[PDB]
Amino acid sequence: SLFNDKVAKLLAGHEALLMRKNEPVEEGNGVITRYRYPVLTAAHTPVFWRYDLNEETNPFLMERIGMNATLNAGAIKWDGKYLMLVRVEGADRKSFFAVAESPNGIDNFRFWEYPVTLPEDVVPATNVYDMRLTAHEDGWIYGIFCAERHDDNAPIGDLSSATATAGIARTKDLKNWERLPDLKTKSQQRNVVLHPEFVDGKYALYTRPQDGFIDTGSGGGIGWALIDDITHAEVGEEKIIDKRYYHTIKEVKNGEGPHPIKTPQGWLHLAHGVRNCAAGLRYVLYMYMTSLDDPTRLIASPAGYFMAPVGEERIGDVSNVLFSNGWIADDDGKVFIYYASSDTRMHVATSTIERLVDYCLHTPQDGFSSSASVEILKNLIERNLRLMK
Amino acid sequence: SLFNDKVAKLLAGHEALLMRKNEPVEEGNGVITRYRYPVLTAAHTPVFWRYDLNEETNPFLMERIGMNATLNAGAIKWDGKYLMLVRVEGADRKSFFAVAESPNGIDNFRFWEYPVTLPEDVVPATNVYDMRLTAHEDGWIYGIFCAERHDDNAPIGDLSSATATAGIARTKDLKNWERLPDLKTKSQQRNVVLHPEFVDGKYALYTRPQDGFIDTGSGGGIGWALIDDITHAEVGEEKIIDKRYYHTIKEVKNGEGPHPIKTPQGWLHLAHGVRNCAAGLRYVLYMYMTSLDDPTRLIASPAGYFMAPVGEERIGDVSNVLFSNGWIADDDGKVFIYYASSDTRMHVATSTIERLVDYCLHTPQDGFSSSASVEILKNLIERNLRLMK
Amino acid sequence: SLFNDKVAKLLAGHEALLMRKNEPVEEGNGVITRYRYPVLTAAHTPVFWRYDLNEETNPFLMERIGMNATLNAGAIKWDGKYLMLVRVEGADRKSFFAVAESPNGIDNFRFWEYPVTLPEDVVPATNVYDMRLTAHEDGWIYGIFCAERHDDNAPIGDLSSATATAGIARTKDLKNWERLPDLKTKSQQRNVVLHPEFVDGKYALYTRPQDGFIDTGSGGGIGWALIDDITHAEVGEEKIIDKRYYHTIKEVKNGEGPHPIKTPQGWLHLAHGVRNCAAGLRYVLYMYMTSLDDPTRLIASPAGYFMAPVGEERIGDVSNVLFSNGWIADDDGKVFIYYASSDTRMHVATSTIERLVDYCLHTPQDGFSSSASVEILKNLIERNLRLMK
Amino acid sequence: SLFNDKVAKLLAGHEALLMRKNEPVEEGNGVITRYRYPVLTAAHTPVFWRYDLNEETNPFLMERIGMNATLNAGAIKWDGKYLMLVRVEGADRKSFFAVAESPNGIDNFRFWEYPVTLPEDVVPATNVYDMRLTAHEDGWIYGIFCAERHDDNAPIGDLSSATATAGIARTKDLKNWERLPDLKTKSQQRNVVLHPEFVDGKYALYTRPQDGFIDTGSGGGIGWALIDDITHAEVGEEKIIDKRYYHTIKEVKNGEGPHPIKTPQGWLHLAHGVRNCAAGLRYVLYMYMTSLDDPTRLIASPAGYFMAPVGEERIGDVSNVLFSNGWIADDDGKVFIYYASSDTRMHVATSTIERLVDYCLHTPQDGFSSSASVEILKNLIERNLRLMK
């Protein structure tokens, strides 16, 4: 029948998309390798999420539930597989979480047949997004995410005013999730992330205090807060670890991405930085390192951005954005960086622990001015010209 | 496992290839419409024909039986479906027959899981090829094909001299085939085709007498022979119906393609014509019509070729060749022409009975010289310029 | 109406094709510059040559007269315009001549609305082809071409054996052509070309004696023959000017292309050379020069080919062929070379008289062996490495 | 200056071409992996082979010595590098030998600055081609090649009749070559190849007896001949090891490619097979194995071709041809197969010894008929369908 043939073709096209082999992009900077294809797009969502496959109830075979975007994904190595904890945004503009797995980390990602069922905390949330997974030493996998609600305290007609809180959930199988109380804090929070080890016997959070829903205001950067009880999480003291700076890629806002990777040289961090331009907000990725002895102490601040939008990455629902809240480091040192472009699709970039540490340690620090940048550059040129002669 | 993933990808890629929607080529001549993709290539043969899918016996997952070409296919409308009787040539250089079926005639052709099992006649054949299917009024589907054997008259070292006979088989299901005796005749034959109706109460064959295996010699063109008994087929009287002519597209050789289509205006024929050039033999398609009252009598001879190699068609194992031995005319008058290019792949072109008859009746006849061609052309130009003013 | 819209689209698409700007190919050898697009293809023939545009007599709007190829064109600068004398081959396999003109020499060639009407000589010809135009000092434009007829000596069934004579016609407007008697000669001739000046007060022809229709046999190369009376042309004395040589690009056959260009350094010639290979005959272009004092005396023989098939040129009705019988040299020294590829389409390449003479004079002569080729090459390498150090 | 800029651009473009990274073709058959780009083309020859770079003597900066093709290359692993012994054909139609080297075997091949200087034997040769390199246990690198001369028996006008002898040269550095006497034998020979080990204390050659220059006539296949003294080489006893067969890919001609690779399972051979078709001669590659105990004894004959022209490979000066006379097997079992397409360019395909042996041992043998091919195929289908259920 024509209908059954159409269903068969939908499924066949979907399998071909899912199984497509990724290929590295040859041209790169020696730090990271980009890949030709995204690891996930809205088109990667299962056919059976979007279409009613029953001819009786969907004789035209049209989509019943449109899928808009697959973005800002957490990540974890799980039972030998490479997992993303994907933020999937429907055509209805709500996001939900969904696990996708790959045998190799760069292609053949496939969504688990059901997305994540996440219980509400005591106050219901309208949207949930951007989960960071932490396999904590306490034996749980934590997902720290943004729980967003309308702010009724707004002028009449204002349906955009919102509040962001840090949601906390944990699981041991990524299917059954326990929702803990939202983080209690004196400011709005987004980009909260759980450090994987106890520090002074306490849970440690990366935080990002902000005066408003979109603007940080007095919020000084990426914060650090020790928490006595993750099941009744409340910030007491909050210390800024990585600061915003005028005329850097992290001027207006910044935030921790995934939880950092432990290296012999220190904690290796991946974050985003924001500045304003004539086209709106521009988001890039950057890195920093902190001490093993004192994870609050910066020990490497390579100047500028680590990755910024290239090519197809530049365009999407929210253009001029890269964002990451997930990466995986294998035992052999290979690193898989899962980053979204333009709030629309997920990509992978690969590197190694040794290369990322080399990048952090030997990319000169920002001296904060054009004159300083020129002096750093002239010094390198002088070395190279001597060598090339 | 890596092996199972590899098998799953082979199957998935194959399904995507098989299900690809064909699209008509916009640029055309108003007679036939070409399509963007071939209907069959060697890559269309089933994965399970080529690969041993068992890891125990094929751990590297390599092809065990290479497929080289899918060409010169017969065709029949069968139980609501569009069928080709494909000549499939293996990497071993032997050909065999195999049914492929489509729901619509222009794409989604898929081979039946097993190819054709064709019993030998009394004298075994080395190769069999180019089967024309005829649904005869006697209730059988006949396949008339070429059965080729090494020429025993050949001297030491000559492993190329061959003989061609017309093989005859029949079936009622395209799975169980009865092999009848090879056609008895005084010359070599290839391109023998069964006319679908009795004529004077006898079976009627299109023939192509030839003095040698490749060259026709004294062979004058496409012949017509009435046969009393198809189960003991022997040519007696033989008349040339469509002749070779110097400096036409059918100078050196010609041959009937599929059996002709019955129209109210006469029998509509599709044939091939051959000439020599610096690059070897060049094969094109051409049409002609014969009378319903007397199928041996020509009533339309449009000048020149009907189709010749265009673009991708020009290149293959045997370049500069189009060949057809199959077409299907639906009750609504739509015609699906199945033609091979360069002995390598199968294509489809579509037309209608009305357009093909129009083409045959109103394409001026060849006057056989440059001066005559110019006079025909000047006449048309004069009419058009008068109209365009 | 749908019909009128269809006609309007045919005309519009044709105009867009005709007006397309050509672009030079950047990669070249410094001798000639190729161009991205052919100057003519079969699709360039007028819409009103191919279609009957009257809905009453062609309601399906299909082509009534197919055009197959535009090839082997003569060329002349004429009343400020760049003209080709095109060999146009119909789908009927007959060729006829047709003028096409361009304002600039590299694109926007358009056929004159009517093709050439060429009267027959006393014995009618089946095909005419490959006309070389010569603006002779006697005030006439001569076209010397091949007039082909079926060989009456041929046995039953032989519809391929043919004879080639040199046809001679002249005109003062390229519209009204006077057919003079075919050249009288003791062998078959093709590639006969009129030298533009009297020599010893006589007409001078380039000739190409050949024992057969396709193969030259004892024919030694490109010949030279003085003719008292072009209106009763008969060869008496005949001298070979440029010879075939074993293991060169002109081993099996050769022939003069267009008439040579007069330069201060001598007559600049363009010719074709043929050898056999596993795929058939391979045709390339080559150049040579002869003395102004004695046009029968070679003064430059650059080794090897001048042009050979590249890319798209390699494929067509008769693949692996370049052929030229037309070029134009402007007063400023710019040269437009019109060459066919694969008997299918017409191309242009540009150079200058200075560059072509440079090429002829300073491309080393063929020493006729691998050892000699290596010695020439090692000498150049040695010079370059010395320079590059 | 404009001239110096032009030279700098020629050199820069050439370096970019030479350094281009090759990429494997994903679609394959599991036996061999093809690559996206040729390893060598005529454009890969050095700029300083083709252009005179001195403005004084070449002010137009045009090529002085055209290069036409890089084909049929021998191969050897040499001092840690991957070397081809390239047949380079000039625009003058003569070939010469030239070493090209790569660090990795699949790209970045670069010609040595000077080509090979090969001394003549007592009788000079017009062309030399298709050298097979053998690192013999006697400590020398031998190159066995074809030395071609015009046939003196030829009649007037015949500049094509030629004779082929087996040329023998040796070297210890690929720069200084000693020319030994041409092989003495009772028939013409081409595709002669030196086996790398003594057999019965004697040199062993693969041979290919042929009655004519192009056609083998009574020549039965690939031969084997023991030679006492390679410096006065003469064939005595000669045995056919791999035979031509009607209706196989090696019907008309065959010949050994490179010398075979030693494996624990036997000698692994790569050869070419030829048949005739309407377009001329068609050349494909095939494999076979012989015994370690007795290298004259066949132990594996996989049916059909190993590789045949695909895509771009199908077209060139001599289309419809693959040819190999070189491959390299690394100690780790990786195999680099260097094969020419269409006598025009050089390609690489990769495999492993294990895969190639698997292919030879488990691709079913040719049963020599359509019925046999169908039975082999039906058996595999039956196994697969049983597995797939």
Ligand SMILES: OC[C@H]1O[C@@H](O)[C@@H](O)[C@@H](O)[C@@H]1O
């Ligand atoms: O950002 C868009 C433009 O912004 C303006 O301020 C200009 O000064 C430019 O520096 C810049 O191109």
Ligand SMILES: OC[C@H]1O[C@@H](O)[C@@H](O)[C@@H](O)[C@@H]1O
């Ligand atoms: O090879 C070109 C053509 O040759 C003829 O003999 C036909 O029988 C076809 O089988 C083939 O397409």
Ligand SMILES: OC[C@H]1O[C@@H](O)[C@@H](O)[C@@H](O)[C@@H]1O
């Ligand atoms: O077919 C290749 C060539 O053959 C020769 O005979 C020429 O006369 C040309 O007409 C043609 O281009």
Ligand SMILES: OC[C@H]1O[C@@H](O)[C@@H](O)[C@@H](O)[C@@H]1O
């Ligand atoms: O031309 C096709 C092939 O012809 C054969 O003679 C071989 O010797 C090769 O030199 C060539 O590749």
Ligand SMILES: OC[C@H]1O[C@@H](O)[C@H](O)[C@@H](O)[C@@H]1O
């Ligand atoms: O910019 C703040 C937030 O605004 C919301 O509307 C979007 O859904 C988020 O993805 C975004 O992070």
Ligand SMILES: OC[C@H]1O[C@@H](O)[C@H](O)[C@@H](O)[C@@H]1O
């Ligand atoms: O040309 C005659 C025949 O020759 C055979 O070798 C080919 O297999 C056929 O396809 C072809 O029709």
Ligand SMILES: OC[C@H]1O[C@@H](O)[C@H](O)[C@@H](O)[C@@H]1O
């Ligand atoms: O090869 C000789 C001639 O043969 C004819 O059949 C072709 O029409 C000519 O174009 C060709 O030049």
Ligand SMILES: OC[C@H]1O[C@@H](O)[C@H](O)[C@@H](O)[C@@H]1O
């Ligand atoms: O076909 C036989 C030989 O003919 C020669 O003219 C070619 O140069 C060779 O490459 C070829 O192998």
